[PDB]
Amino acid sequence: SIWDHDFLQSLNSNYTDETYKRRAEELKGKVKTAIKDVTEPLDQLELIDNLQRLGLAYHFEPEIRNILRNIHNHNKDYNWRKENLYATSLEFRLLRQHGYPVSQEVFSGFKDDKVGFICDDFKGILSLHEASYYSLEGESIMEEAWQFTSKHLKEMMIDVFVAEQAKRALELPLHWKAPMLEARWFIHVYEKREDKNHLLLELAKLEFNTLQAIYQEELKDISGWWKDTGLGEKLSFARNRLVASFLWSMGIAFEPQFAYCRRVLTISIALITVIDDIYDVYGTLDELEIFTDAVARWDINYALKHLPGYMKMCFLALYNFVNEFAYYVLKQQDFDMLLSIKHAWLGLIQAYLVEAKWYHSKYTPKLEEYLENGLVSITGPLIITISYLSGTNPIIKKELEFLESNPDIVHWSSKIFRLQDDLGTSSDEIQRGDVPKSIQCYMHETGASEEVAREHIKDMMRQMWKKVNAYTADKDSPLTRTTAEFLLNLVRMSHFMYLHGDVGFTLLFQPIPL
Ligand SMILES: CC(C)=CCC/C(C)=C(/F)COP(=O)(O)OP(=O)(O)O
Ligand SMILES: [Mn+2]
Ligand SMILES: [Mn+2]
Numbered sequence: 001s002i003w004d005h006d007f008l009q010s011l012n013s014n015y016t017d018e019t020y021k022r023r024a025e026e027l028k029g030k031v032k033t034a035i036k037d038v039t040e041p042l043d044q045l046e047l048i049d050n051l052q053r054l055g056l057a058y059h060f061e062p063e064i065r066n067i068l069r070n071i072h073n074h075n076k077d078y079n080w081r082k083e084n085l086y087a088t089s090l091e092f093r094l095l096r097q098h099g100y101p102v103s104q105e106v107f108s109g110f111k112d113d114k115v116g117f118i119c120d121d122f123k124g125i126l127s128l129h130e131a132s133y134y135s136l137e138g139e140s141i142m143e144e145a146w147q148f149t150s151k152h153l154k155e156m157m158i159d160v161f162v163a164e165q166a167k168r169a170l171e172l173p174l175h176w177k178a179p180m181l182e183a184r185w186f187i188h189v190y191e192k193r194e195d196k197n198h199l200l201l202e203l204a205k206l207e208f209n210t211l212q213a214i215y216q217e218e219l220k221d222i223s224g225w226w227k228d229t230g231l232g233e234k235l236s237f238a239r240n241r242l243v244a245s246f247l248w249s250m251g252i253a254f255e256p257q258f259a260y261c262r263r264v265l266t267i268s269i270a271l272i273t274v275i276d277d278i279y280d281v282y283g284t285l286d287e288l289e290i291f292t293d294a295v296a297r298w299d300i301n302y303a304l305k306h307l308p309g310y311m312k313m314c315f316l317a318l319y320n321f322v323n324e325f326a327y328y329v330l331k332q333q334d335f336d337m338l339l340s341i342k343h344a345w346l347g348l349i350q351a352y353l354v355e356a357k358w359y360h361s362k363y364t365p366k367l368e369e370y371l372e373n374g375l376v377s378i379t380g381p382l383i384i385t386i387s388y389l390s391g392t393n394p395i396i397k398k399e400l401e402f403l404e405s406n407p408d409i410v411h412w413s414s415k416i417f418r419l420q421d422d423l424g425t426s427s428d429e430i431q432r433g434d435v436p437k438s439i440q441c442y443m444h445e446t447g448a449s450e451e452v453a454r455e456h457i458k459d460m461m462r463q464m465w466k467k468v469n470a471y472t473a474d475k476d477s478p479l480t481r482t483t484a485e486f487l488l489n490l491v492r493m494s495h496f497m498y499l500h501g502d503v504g505f506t507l508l509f510q511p512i513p514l
């Protein structure tokens with residue numbers, strides 16, 4: 001709670017300035033023509049990989065699109081599959097990542113039907129491990145690939161850079177991380193390379209520092225809004241979680257053009273944090289039922305008449321925030337989304353009530369019934385609604401209605417989110433055992449120990465990602481690929497924050513030197 005309002009207002013990054021933005025345009029051009037001189041397919045694939053991990057890919061989307069579509073055109077040619085496990089895995093990953101069909105059969109040559117995968121090259125095993133997270137349901141080569149590579153990478157840790165790479169891939173594969181989060185680590189990896197492109201590296205450092213400066217300015221503005229509502233003064237438990245909330249919102253949507261999206265997400269998350277504390281710590285069941293009903297009615301007069309005192313400000317802050325959100329979209333693009341957004345908020349609040357009734361009844365649901373409700377209460381459906389409504393111009397009515405139909409991709413993405421959050425519960429918190437989350441439900445239902453339940457839940461997430469990979473590749477859903485990314489980035493942020501939940505200070509506030 002050190003990064004308070006006064007601290008945020010005091011920042012004055014040098015990289016907001018117009019001179020830096022000029023040198024960035026200069027470097028972007030010199031990089032675009034250097035990309036023209038990359039003609040060998042593996043070099044092109046390694047180029048895309050580098051652009052993505054450096055945080056630079058959204059500046060070169062046409063150039064990446066061209067490389068990838070040309071490689072797709074060519075990769076059924078006769079002697080294309082050189083049978084380099086590293087190169088085959090890199091290509092499989094990048095093509096699947098960007099929605100191009102590639103069969104799991106590209107790996108069958110590295111695999112004996114009796115003894116499994118045969119490889120001793122760490123580079124190829126690492127790349128195959130990353131590629132296995134792009135698997136679909138029922139791809140037994142890819143499942144077997146993951147078994148083989150994770151076993152090999154674990155034994156790798158029982159050369160100093162090799163151990164670090166194995167550790168990093170085991171705790172967070174590339175498919176499970178949003179692009180900017182890794183940028184500072186990879187930027188240093190990249191400059192320590194003999195063959196580094198020097199302009200690219202300099203562009204990566206500059207764009208990282210400019211992004212920080214952009215976010216600091218947004219934080220000054222969001223900070224003032226939080227101060228004005230004064231919830232942190234009324235409710236002694238309403239701690240300032242603004243920077244933490246902004247971190248989630250930046251993981252959901254990092255690009256400069258999504259400033260409004262990050263603002264609405266940050267304030268939504270700060271309010272969710274307070275409301276959630278009310279529902280599973282401070283409110284009595286009778287109070288929780290009035291607040292639920294006041295949300296459902298969406299009637300300020302009723303709410304001020306009937307709510308407890310310590311709930312009136314929290315409700316009116318939500319109410320006015322959402323009504324101004326609706327106003328902003330109406331003004332911007334003449335779309336009326338109030339019923340949608342307040343419906344999404346109601347679903348969250350209702351899911352919270354269900355959990356509070358479970359807790360007072362000392363009822364312990366089976367994992368499946370817990371997750372049905374828990375995927376809503378983790379805020380997945382609300383957050384993708386918020387992201388879509390604040391991050392899309394023009395809003396497509398058909399696209400919004402698909403989100404409101406509770407589609408499969410939202411269902412399974414939010415289940416992962418919920419499982420991943422519940423894994424953040426600690427061991428001493430399982431023993432007092434008051435309110436039951438994923439681990440306790442699974443232990444009660446299977447008799448597994450806590451340690452085994454954690455491992456089974458971690459495997460469940462990896463299997464559920466396989467379903468998400470299928471919905472992401474479905475070119476026939478109403479969700480654009482842009483909208484789906486908000487959702488995946490939410491899940492990825494939960495994976496990242498389980499590891500690190502000071503990296504937020506490092507992401508937002510300390511530039512990369514020179
Ligand atoms: C921040 C965000 C994007 C969504 C809210 C869910 C989340 C990840 C939390 F950390 C909220 O607290 P908590 O872990 O207490 O949520 P609970 O487990 O009580 O439902
Ligand atoms: Mn809760
Ligand atoms: Mn909680």
Ligand SMILES: [Mn+2]
Nearest residue numbers: 421422424425
């Ligand atoms: Mn939790």
